[PDB]
Every structure is written in structure tokens, then in C-alpha cells.
Design a protein around this ligand. Sequence first.
Ligand SMILES: [Mg+2]
Lengths: 372, 374
Amino acid sequence: EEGKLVIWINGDKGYNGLAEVGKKFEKDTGIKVTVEHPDKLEEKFPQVAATGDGPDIIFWAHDRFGGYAQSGLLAEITPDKAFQDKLYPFTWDAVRYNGKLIAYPIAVEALSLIYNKDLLPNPPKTWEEIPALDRELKAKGKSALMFNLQEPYFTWPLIAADGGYAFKYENGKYDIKDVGVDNAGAKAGLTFLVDLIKNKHMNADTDYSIAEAAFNKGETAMTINGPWAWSNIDTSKVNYGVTVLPTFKGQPSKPFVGVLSAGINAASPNKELAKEFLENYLLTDEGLEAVNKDKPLGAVALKSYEEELAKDPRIAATMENAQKGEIMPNIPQMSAFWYAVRTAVINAASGRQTVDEALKDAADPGYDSIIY
Amino acid sequence: EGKLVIWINGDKGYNGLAEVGKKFEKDTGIKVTVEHPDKLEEKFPQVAATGDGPDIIFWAHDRFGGYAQSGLLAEITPDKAFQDKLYPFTWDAVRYNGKLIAYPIAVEALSLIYNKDLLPNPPKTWEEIPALDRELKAKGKSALMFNLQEPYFTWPLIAADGGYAFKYENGKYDIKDVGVDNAGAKAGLTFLVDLIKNKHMNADTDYSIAEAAFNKGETAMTINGPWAWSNIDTSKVNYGVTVLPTFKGQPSKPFVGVLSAGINAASPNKELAKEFLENYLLTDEGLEAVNKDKPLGAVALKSYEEELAKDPRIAATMENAQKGEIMPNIPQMSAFWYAVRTAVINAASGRQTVDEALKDAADPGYDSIIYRMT
Ligand SMILES: [Mg+2]
């Protein structure tokens, strides 16, 4: 099935805009490009490719692609130095597996601090400031901060700020023997979170929908969330802004970064066409804008178009928190790690475990991450 | 509803079971249907959610803990008089969170199997085995070959001096407390690693190799379970089945598998199923019927086991089972086996020392084979 391009992308992306780029590529080359948005595409792709079928190009979060590459399902991509120079260097980091590039970065996503400009026109630059801020707001019938404490993705930026990390990352490789989740930095960040809860500035039970409800009805001055939340805040009419996360111990909060990426199916007989399409049609200002026009990509990896889009301070902030954070590791071990950390944060925040006990357990999981 | 549907595996005496079912019909008018679907153990948890599934399911006890965790088995209710009819240790196999969730039927474990021609008096101790091997090597033979690749076979020696899997207390297994790197576990694995270094055994021996050598009269001894007997019968080798060797004067401790009969939580026939199992199956004539069709080996019923154990091979199965431990009925055991399997391969091959291989199996880290996909 040579001579064409079949592309899979998720249904919450601008697939109709990507279809217009496919139509331009066909006008110029005569090669037909078909864009599909299957349900469950990231589960379906290894099922169909592993028997040398599937699309020629697949778009998904970079972290799943480690999995695919481990199974030999993705081609090494081959952009020259001049092409790689057009994207932010930290993005190339996300699409490396065994020192080889395995996908093109497209867009970048990370948490930011979202604030209610009517309640809080000058938001805090530091975590250490938030308790006093909370006191002032509580006197007005409001609170300083609510965010999801049930999922450790949302709490991680504070945990990593003073030096906590998941898996040491050096020379383009994760050392899974070297876990940083119980080091002195991680303990200090988590102890700060636990103290906030002990001191009634936050509630251990708060989850994604409680925090979103409070922010969007103007009951709390701040929340921590990502660009997937903006359109709900737009519906609410809150006058919000989006900014840099606070520092802790004078160091930046470090959210994990998700890189929407495009990989080439190892079994495609159309690898050269895929490279030309991605490098010369999609990853240019005109190509990304065709997609963005349809549904906003957020912050993008291509520097020239990101600079254009970053006139929107919300998008500038996303990129700013992303460059201060770290790439989500693309290794299969992350899912056991996230399960152990999630228990750790819940147990420390409830009083069930101390911070030191909780985190030692996350670093040294034993059999704890084999469910059920 | 007003019937019983039973699932049992095709390798068991299902025709013998269907005959017990007929006897139940004659007495009660209740039709009993015995089915042997393929992968019944994977099907059961699927269909006991479409309300469907058999009234009774026969399977190894260790898969039952998973079913009980999901609420798929009823609590069974034998009186104490009935409980007294079965070996006490078999009831321990079918407890989940304090509650009895199946009736035990039969018991299986590894024994030491020996060629009476080469070795009329088998060693009582592992410690004896190197001098024995030297004697046989001088004759073109070997003392001992068994499957070294699967740690179910090496476990009896590891556990002899103190090795344990998950600590077991107040009727549950504690997945946070692992006993495979204690001094006992290190002593026995070191013994086994030394037998390899000293060339009494070969690190590459697997199930096939060991079976072919014992069955061709090439090695005096092997370690295997009742499922291997019929191939040895065919080979015509003159064999005995006996107690495993002791290590540091303590019995080897193999893991025990108990075939058990569970009642579906969603059955409207739980009372019929209880009278069927208690008063028709778990009797001398009920078990006899099944056993005639395919042998049960060692059974849980005290009165019938006394009869079967005048076969010394079945006596040895039960002896070794009573010296061993019930296989943990938790889903973590597959991971435990994957981690121990690697540790023994690595210790055996010098890729790791015993101390480090077992440390890794007791407390797996993110580097562990259990958290890989590959
Ligand atoms: Mg070029």
C-alpha cells in the first residue's frame, strides 16, 4: 500500500485543519493524504502495525511513543540540523529513544498557575507567600488556592522544585536504578503541601471537579491546571489570567511536559513522503496555522510560529512553565511510578503516613505497583 | 434454577463426576450437567458478570483468591462435623479474608522420584548429593536432574532453611513483607548454585531435558509432580516416589496446589450445590467414581486418602504436601515467580551473586523484570 499517506490523529485535535494541509500536499505532489480520527487510536496502533498494517503517520503524546519504539513499531526519523534548528531543543529530547529520534515534536503542554484577576490582580511569585494570602482572602469569604490533590501530576511541580525527580536523566537516558522521589528536595516540597492542608489553606479531599467548580464560580483566587481547562473558564466568564507557577525555596516549580508528536510507522513503504509532508508542509507557519485555525494547538515546538502565538500571554506562560519543567519520561516504568507516588501523596496528606515514610515507599515500591 | 451446571477441566475425571451427578438426579430429581469448556478459568470471571456461569467450578485453589476478591464465589457453610472429615491443612487453602470460599478435593506437590535400579536407597539429605554424583559420574550417570528454569521446582530447597514468599498472618498475605532474601533463602540457593559450579548439575537443564534423562535411565533422581508419572510408567524405568531430601536437617518445603470446588455467588442453587458436594462428591464412593475415571492423586477426604495412600507414590505426595506450604492465593504471585525466576537464572549464571539476586527478588525496584513491558 505504497504511494499515499494515511494519518491518525486524536479527535480532540484539528483534524479538519490537518486535512487542508493534506489537500495542499496533494495539489503539489499528486499524493493522496487521508486523515482519520479513530476512537482508541493509541491502543489500536500496536494491534494493527505489529502485523505491518496501520497508518503511515500517527499523532499522539510523546510518552506513549517509547512503548512503540521498544516494540520496533516506529521508524528513525532523519531531519537534518537545519530542520532541527527550527524547533526548540528541549522538544527533541522528548522524542528520543535509545539515542535515536523517533517522532517530530508538534505541540507542548504543561501546567500553569491560573488566577482570578478581579480577586487577585497581582498573583504570588512564591509558594511561601500563599498562606498569608489565604488569610487575607478568608477575611473576604474566599480562599487563595484550590487544585486537584488526588492526582500526583498536579502536585509534582512543587515536589520537584527543590530537587525531587522521578528517574535520573543523563546523556539522553533514564537511569531506572536512580530514583529521586524520596530525596531531600522531594520531601521538602511534599512537606510544604502537607502543611498547607494541616493549616487549612487546602483540603486533602479536593479533586479535579471540586477545584474546577470553585475556580469557575469565583470562590478561590487561583488554581493549577492546563490549557485543556481554559475553554470551561471562558464559558464561566471569570476574568482570569495564566502565569508562571510560584517558586519554592527560590527555585522554579517543574511541571512534567507532554509533547504532541508525529511518528512514522516502521512498516510504512511511504517513509520518504512522510518526511517531506511533515517537514515541508505541516511543520511550517502555514501548516501549523491551518491546524490551529480549526482547534488551537496551544504552545508549539516550531519557534517561528510559537513566537507568533505567544502574543497570547496564556500560551507564553504554558511555554514558560514547560521550559522550567521536565519532559514526561517515555519509559514503560512511569505507570508503576505514578501509581506509587499517587498513594504516597494521598497517605501523606491524610496523616496515614508521614512524608518520609510515604516517599520512601514510592522510591522503593517492591510489589506494590503490581495490581490487583 | 432447580439444576446444577458444573465446570471442571478436561484433564480431570469428568465422566466419573458426571456419574456422581446421575446419582444425585436419581435421589432428588435434579439434573446435573458436567461441562469442560476450554480456558474455563478465564471464562468464569467473564460470565459470572452476565449473571450467567456454572453453579459449581472446579479449579486449583490459588485462582480462587482472585475470584473471591471480585465477589464471584459464595461463602460455603459446612458444619464442624463435615469440616472434621477433611485434612485441616486443606481448609487453609480455601480461606479468603477469614471466610471459607470452596471445598477442597485433592492435593498436589513435588516429590523426589528415583530409579530403584541405579539407586535402591535414595539419599535423605541434599548434603549427600555431591558424593553420590561423583559415584555415578564414574559410572557414566548423574545423581540428579530436574527443571532448573522454573523456580516452582527449586523452591523446595530455597524454602527449607527459612525462605518464604509473602508473610502470611491473620489470614492474609502481606505483599510488603517478602522472605526470599533471608538467611534461609540464601543458604539453599547457595547450595543449589554450588551444585551447578561444582558440575553436579547444569544451569541449562529444563523440563524436557530432565524428563528425558530420568526416563532413559541416565540420572538416578529427578524432582517432579504426579502429572509426570504416566510418562515414567511408559518408559518402564523401575522408579520410587518418596520424601524430598532434607537440607540443614529441615524438610524441603514444596508449594501445594489444592483442586477445589467453588460455588458461584450468583447461583440460585447454592443449597443444592452444598448437598451435592458434601453428601455425594466428598464421600468415599463419590471420589472413587471420579478417581477411577482419572486419578485424583492425594485427596482431602481423610477416609478415602487412607485407602489411596496404600499406593506409596500417593503417600509420598501427601507427605511432601504436609511438609510444604499452600501456594499463596493472591494475584501478586505471578510477579513473585517472575522475579524469583530471574534471580535464580542470574545467580546460577554468575550474572549476580546470590545476595544481590535475592535482594532484587525480595524488594523489586523500578529496574525489575516485573516492571518491564518488553
Ligand atoms: Mg534540508
